[PDB]
A paper describes a structure:
Lectins are carbohydrate binding proteins unrelated to immunoglobulins that display no enzymatic activity towards the recognized sugars. Lectins purified from seeds of the Diocleinae subtribe exhibit a high degree of sequence identity notwithstanding that they show very distinct biological activities. In the present study, we used mass spectrometry to determine the amino acid sequence of a lectin from Canavalia boliviana seeds and solved its crystal structure in complex with Xman and the dimannosides Man(α1-3)Man(α1-O)Me and Man(α1-4)Man(α1-O)Me. Furthermore, we characterized the anti-inflammatory properties of Cbol, adding more data to the repertoire of wide biological activities displayed by this group of lectins, despite their highly identical sequence.
Originating from the crystallization condition, nine cadmium ions are observed in the structures Cbol:M13M and Cbol:M14M. Intriguingly, in all but one subunit of the dimannoside complexes, cadmium ions are found coordinated to two asparagines in the small helix Leu81-Val84. The carbohydrate electron densities of M13M and M14M and Xman complexes are well defined in all subunits. In the dimannoside complexes, none of the subunits are involved in extensive interactions with the symmetry mates around the carbohydrate-binding sites, a favourable feature that prevents bias in the structural analysis of the complexes. The O1-linked mannose of both dimannosides, M13M and M14M, as well as Xman, are bound to the monosaccharide binding site in an almost identical way to that observed for ConA, CGL and ConM. The O3- and O4-linked mannose (reducing mannoses, also called here the second mannose) are positioned in a previously described hydrophobic subsite, formed by Tyr12, Leu99 and Tyr100. The side chains of Tyr12, Leu99 and Tyr100 are opposite to the ring of the reducing mannose, which interacts with the protein mainly by hydrophobic and van der Waals interactions. Differences occur in the binding of the dimannosides as result of their distinct glycosidic linkage. Similarly to Cbol, the reducing mannose of M13M when in complex with ConA does not form hydrogen bonds with the protein. In the central cavity of Cbol in complex with dimannosides, there is a strong unexplained density in the vicinity of His127, Met129 and Asn131.
Residue numbers in the entry:
A (entry chain D), B (entry chain B), C (entry chain A), D (entry chain C): 1 to 237
Write the structure that this text describes.
Amino acid sequence: ADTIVAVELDTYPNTDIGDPSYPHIGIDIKSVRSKKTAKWNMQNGKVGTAHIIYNSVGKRLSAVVSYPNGDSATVSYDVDLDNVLPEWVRVGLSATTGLYKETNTILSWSFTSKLKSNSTHETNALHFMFNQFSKDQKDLILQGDATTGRDGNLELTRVSSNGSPQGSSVGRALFYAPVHIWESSAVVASFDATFTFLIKSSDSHPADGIAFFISNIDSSIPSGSTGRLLGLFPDAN
Amino acid sequence: ADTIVAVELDTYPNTDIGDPSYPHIGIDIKSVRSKKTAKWNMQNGKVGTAHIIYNSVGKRLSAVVSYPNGDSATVSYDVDLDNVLPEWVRVGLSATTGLYKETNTILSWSFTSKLKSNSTHETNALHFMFNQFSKDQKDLILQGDATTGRDGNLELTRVSSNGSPQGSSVGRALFYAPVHIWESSAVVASFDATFTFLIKSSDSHPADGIAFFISNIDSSIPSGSTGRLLGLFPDAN
Amino acid sequence: ADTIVAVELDTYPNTDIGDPSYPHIGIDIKSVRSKKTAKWNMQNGKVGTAHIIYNSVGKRLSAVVSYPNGDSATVSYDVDLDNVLPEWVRVGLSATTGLYKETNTILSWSFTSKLKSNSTHETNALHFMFNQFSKDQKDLILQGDATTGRDGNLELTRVSSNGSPQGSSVGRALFYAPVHIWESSAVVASFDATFTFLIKSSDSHPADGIAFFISNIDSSIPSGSTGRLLGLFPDAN
Amino acid sequence: ADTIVAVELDTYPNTDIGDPSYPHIGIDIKSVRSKKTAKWNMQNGKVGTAHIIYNSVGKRLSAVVSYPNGDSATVSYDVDLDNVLPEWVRVGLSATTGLYKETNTILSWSFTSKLKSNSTHETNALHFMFNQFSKDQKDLILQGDATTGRDGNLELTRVSSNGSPQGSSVGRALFYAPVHIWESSAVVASFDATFTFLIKSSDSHPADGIAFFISNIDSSIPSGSTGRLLGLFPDAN
Ligand SMILES: CO[C@H]1O[C@H](CO)[C@@H](O)[C@H](O[C@H]2O[C@H](CO)[C@@H](O)[C@H](O)[C@@H]2O)[C@@H]1O
Ligand SMILES: CO[C@H]1O[C@H](CO)[C@@H](O)[C@H](O[C@H]2O[C@H](CO)[C@@H](O)[C@H](O)[C@@H]2O)[C@@H]1O
Ligand SMILES: CO[C@H]1O[C@H](CO)[C@@H](O)[C@H](O[C@H]2O[C@H](CO)[C@@H](O)[C@H](O)[C@@H]2O)[C@@H]1O
Ligand SMILES: CO[C@H]1O[C@H](CO)[C@@H](O)[C@H](O[C@H]2O[C@H](CO)[C@@H](O)[C@H](O)[C@@H]2O)[C@@H]1O
Ligand SMILES: [Ca+2]
Ligand SMILES: [Ca+2]
Ligand SMILES: [Ca+2]
Ligand SMILES: [Ca+2]
Ligand SMILES: [Mn+2]
Ligand SMILES: [Mn+2]
Ligand SMILES: [Mn+2]
Ligand SMILES: [Mn+2]
């Protein structure tokens, strides 16, 4: 199996797999069952923003989601990713729809990764920013139902010609280049991520959500990962 | 009295005032007595590097000091700085020598402050980088015995014409522009500071240390703050 | 007198003073009379964006102003600013109204400056970004009628409580910190400055314009510089 | 054939193919015969630095090569790359050795690409920085004799166990991700590239040079491109 570390924005509360009864954000290490969660009040048809942060020093992974206005949900989990993730990875965005559906749409995505060693300087860095996604995006690796170019946006899960979400959909987008996410000689290994999202659904129950993830370079959508598994895991275990 | 938040690299162990018996790094909130300290083995005559980090999300304040070849010391303190510092502040570097002395010398200093709000984007950023210092540095406010231009560096404590350190010395350097370190409307307020330094002492007991600090805009050296007070505090309380 | 270098967005064609017969963008070295200009059709009530760029390698000072919908204006001037400007300067925005008037309004402003020497690295840099302006902006120096806040914006010329622009009004906004614009040991010295604006005028003839400028550190508004002089130069020479 | 745009540091004067009689820096457009060249006094065994700069406003492609000791060489060419390079490209370094040899070695490399459209606040960007190279660098594609690690440098051309360069060698390193170097909707499309290098040669005549280039994504080393063709070109035309 792949190694996966993800921050999830969970619209659908699948409780039999361990999810809280409320839409929630959570931190996932190698399991669909978050190590930490926070109640999230999503505003249907609104553009939200998610900031994720980690530094090798404080060894605390953090995430915050917020809207204009407005309310915000914060979740933090103490971990040292040196001991979780492999040295090289790929980063990505993943979304699904189960029996219940919704529009999972990325307006913008940015990422920064810094390795600061004990030498001088010495800084290795990777930073990219998408404030929009063209029709043929070469620095993005698209998987499943994920497509770009529509209104300059990125649609993770299948959407019809009228702008209607689809059920049992899964899609993902990984950055083309592999990222060096830590090294043995780096005194500081840090990363920042940010994205904006529009989740719009029709029925009273949208599902299942959006997630930012880090996985081994060859990572791909596991089998039967639509709906509640959010595309990131083969099993709810 | 000023409101100070500082990261101290402490060369000389004043025990009577609460320090540990070994050279140590610490996190000081409004007191010379660190809330969190870590043991630090200083390599005399070598160029060290200090990475200070914070984000309003994890609300954890972190510090690391490293030398090439290995050997770093880490300290971290959970704090929400919205509740300590004023909205508008000035950042700088400070150093002292009491009865025991040492050369507190800065080869490089950089600073990055980001305010990201619940709107879109919208980011307010300030970032500066000093890879060397000139004779007249107009973007720096020098205080006390602090001088620049010598071998292209910044000297925080007084050094003789042969390169010898002096006792009972104190000095500081502040950035000219005030910094907006938080705003009530900012979902994320983050800051990152880095510096390289060379501490070189003759006698077996170097003193008293170096510190990176954030203070009120009008902040100035408190009377009689040399030696153990590191120039940052009027009193050892 | 002060040493000025400016990129001017000129709404009102003063042809006695040497301006072309149309609204124009221009490049002004130490004079209100542009060294170069290009025709600019401004869209009343629309938010535009100006991208200014200079590098000491190609020694070309370029400027472009664009609106949504993709029409723009471009001007470039071959110059070595080594021989024009003082080593240390201040950067800012300046606007005026004449008999005629308009709202000179700034939504966002960002500035990058990098001095890369023949050493290793060695990079000195300043970067600041304002995507909104607070009520009291301590890192800004307001001159004339320039004010901030109430909408989160900066108004360069006097505007009333109802939102109407005023005539014979002049105002400037400079960055607090003096910037090191160039050095003798610098192999490359380059700067980028961007800003967005909204120019709204009730009358058929908006005036007089908006300017991005670079000045000596003690530079202040000259006497009688409103209207056509754009709050930049003492005289029309 | 590939579409190559390059900035060459040419250590060997091949005058039958269009070179000047001195070692030089040059700007190549789809030809081994430069559009612009400059005289370059190279310091054997010294670490030099190259700064490549281009923006879509001034439309001037510039390059500067400087050494500690302050000496430098500068070349510029007026060109609009929209019409030359494909929308998506790949960026990299190339070096070769002919009958005459030399060590082509890279201590650091960095690259920055921005697309700023008329969309007001929408910027797409890619930035990467290598201050050193590990044994297996996954974000790099290595071609020919190019290798990494062991001192954390990048040798573009073959060097033996003792540190001696080899003849008839060719090597190239390309960043893994495809880079979006322009877009029809971008008002400003620019890029910066910087790298440090050490060229050492035993014999009195070092060859053949190092070059930074931008090509089609699938680009590979052309047959018989060693020596004078600098690994960039299939022929001397
Ligand atoms: C009524 O919905 C619950 O019961 C259904 C029948 O057993 C399940 O199909 C359903 O889960 C499926 O839909 C959800 C929501 O989209 C998805 O999260 C889950 O992975 C399944 O695809 C749910 O348990
Ligand atoms: C090493 O001497 C010890 O005792 C002296 C008193 O008898 C002290 O003055 C001395 O401290 C002074 O020097 C230290 C070290 O530089 C400095 O931290 C302290 O502020 C005083 O200036 C020390 O305790
Ligand atoms: C119709 O106004 C023009 O003619 C008037 C009479 O000669 C001028 O006073 C007037 O000058 C003022 O307005 C212009 C346009 O805003 C401005 O450029 C000038 O500096 C004065 O403010 C203008 O020429
Ligand atoms: C003495 O070398 C010159 O004349 C030789 C033929 O007698 C050439 O082969 C030689 O060119 C080869 O070496 C150069 C320098 O390494 C290289 O640029 C060229 O591509 C060939 O490999 C040169 O002209
Ligand atoms: Ca769920
Ligand atoms: Ca002490
Ligand atoms: Ca005018
Ligand atoms: Ca040649
Ligand atoms: Mn969940
Ligand atoms: Mn202490
Ligand atoms: Mn004009
Ligand atoms: Mn040549």
